[PDB]
Symmetry: C11
Subunit: 69 residues, 11 copies
């Protein structure tokens, strides 16, 4: 199973997990402050991940950046 790496480039970045299945909703929001790194899988409970806030992101398709608010 795949994972994404998220490094917060400012305070208060959210890494948000969306529910797997017929229902889609946020089930968790992980707050990152500046310089922290989260490495998060897709899972039986999370089939999509949203990042909000300025962050440097790595996936198997390469580098992407989210831009803040």
């Amino acid at each position: 199973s795949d994972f994404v790496v998220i490094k917060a480039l400012e305070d208060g970045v959210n890494v948000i997990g969306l529910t797997r299945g017929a229902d889609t909703r946020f089930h968790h929001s992980e707050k990152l402050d500046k310089g922290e790194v989260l490495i998060a899988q897709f899972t039986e409970h999370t089939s999509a991940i949203k990042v909000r806030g300025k962050a440097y992101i790595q996936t198997r398709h390469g580098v992407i950046e989210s831009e803040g608010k």
Copy 2:
């Protein structure tokens, strides 16, 4: 299992999941504001994903860009 990355290049980008199965219609729409990123899999319930609005998209087959 495959996934796509969608980065919104303007407010109100719409990432649209189409139902897997004999029937096709959309079952969820996730809107992204400018600069937000969605990383979304193909799943038991989603077998096609449509993007409306200006977005920078990555998949296993490279970069593509939707325009609004």
Copy 3:
């Protein structure tokens, strides 16, 4: 399972899924307008995909471009 990326290059492009099985017919036609991208898998119900209209297409075998009537 494989997927194809289709970006409409004009209004009214149709991505048509053909039924899997002994029977071959169109079960769904997804209409795309200029600029929209559809990323569609092959599935239990769709074993061939036809694209009518001007579009830019990526698959595992590379880029190809459909041209409209």
Copy 4:
């Protein structure tokens, strides 16, 4: 499971499925007009595919071109 990409280079190109099984006969012929693209898998029902008419073809082994 693999697939083949067929772009028609003139009107009336035929993409023909041959039946999987002890028996080999046609089963379906999909007509493509000029510029249309069909992306077709090998399947439980189809184990060989013939292209007749002028088309640009991509498979995992590269590009090939049929001639009418």
Copy 5:
């Protein structure tokens, strides 16, 4: 399974499937006219394929050409 691409370079090219199993015989002969392309798998019924006539062939192992 693996598949082979065969493009007929002259009329009346034969792509022949040999039966899988203890016994080996021809079960099917597919005639290609000049310019036609056959994309053909190995299958439950076919474990060897013979090409007779001038054709351009692609397999996972690269290009080879049969001659009349």
Copy 6:
């Protein structure tokens, strides 16, 4: 056979925080690393996301990244 991440502490007191797999998300363990130590940590039945706090050099299958304290 899961993926793993390599974390090298670049200062004392780095925290490698495992987050619970499953419907609920919480920290189940924080492994504290001192400067120069290396932890090689898999994703597992119990850990589906890993958070790093403090200064560290990190390797994953998508490349190098650095967390900052």
Copy 7:
């Protein structure tokens, strides 16, 4: 399952299947004339193949040539 491609470079080339199992013997010999191609899998019944006569051979390990 792997396969070998054999192009006959002269008449009467023999592609010989050896039986899988405790016993080893030839169960089939396919004769190729000049310019014919045979693409042949390893199978439940065939676990070694022998080529006799002048031919051009491709496998996963590259090209090799048998001589008469």
Copy 8:
């Protein structure tokens, strides 16, 4: 299943296996003297490995060095 190579660059390098499971603690410490190499897998009992001391380390993600 993955493995880590550890080469001790001084005496008393400690390779520490952490328990797989809901609980985390060390269940084994294997000390290495200078110049000894340990090639250790992840296992049913070890899902994280800590190295203390000066060591040269290879994993599938490249080389890394611990400092003691």
Copy 9:
């Protein structure tokens, strides 16, 4: 399952199969004359292959030559 290609460079080459299992002995020796090629898998009955005589060999690990 993997295979070996053997091309005989002289008459009389032997490609010998060794039994899988607790015991090890030769169960078959295939003779190759000059220029003949054998392509031979590992199998349920053969877990090691010995080549005697001069031949050009290819495996997944590249070319080697017996003498």
Copy 10:
């Protein structure tokens, strides 16, 4: 189907030591190689770590490393 390590002894008395798989970790076998002998050894149901003592040239899937006596 498991991974394996190649060990070439560069002096006499090199020991390739197998550590037990499971909850118990101990040495269960020590293979003595003299100069120039090679051992190609798999990870196994019984051996989940391998220790080399003495001067040896080692190849893994991660590359070459050398042990020093």
Copy 11:
């Protein structure tokens, strides 16, 4: 399963199979004379292989030579 290629560069080379399991002992030694090649797998019965005498060895991790 992986395999190793051993080419003996002098007479009397020994390729030694070590038992799989909790017990480790030699179960077989195959003697190779100069210029003989043995291609040997890992198996249910053989989880380590030792070579004694001068030989050129190939494995998935490259070339290594043993010296007598």
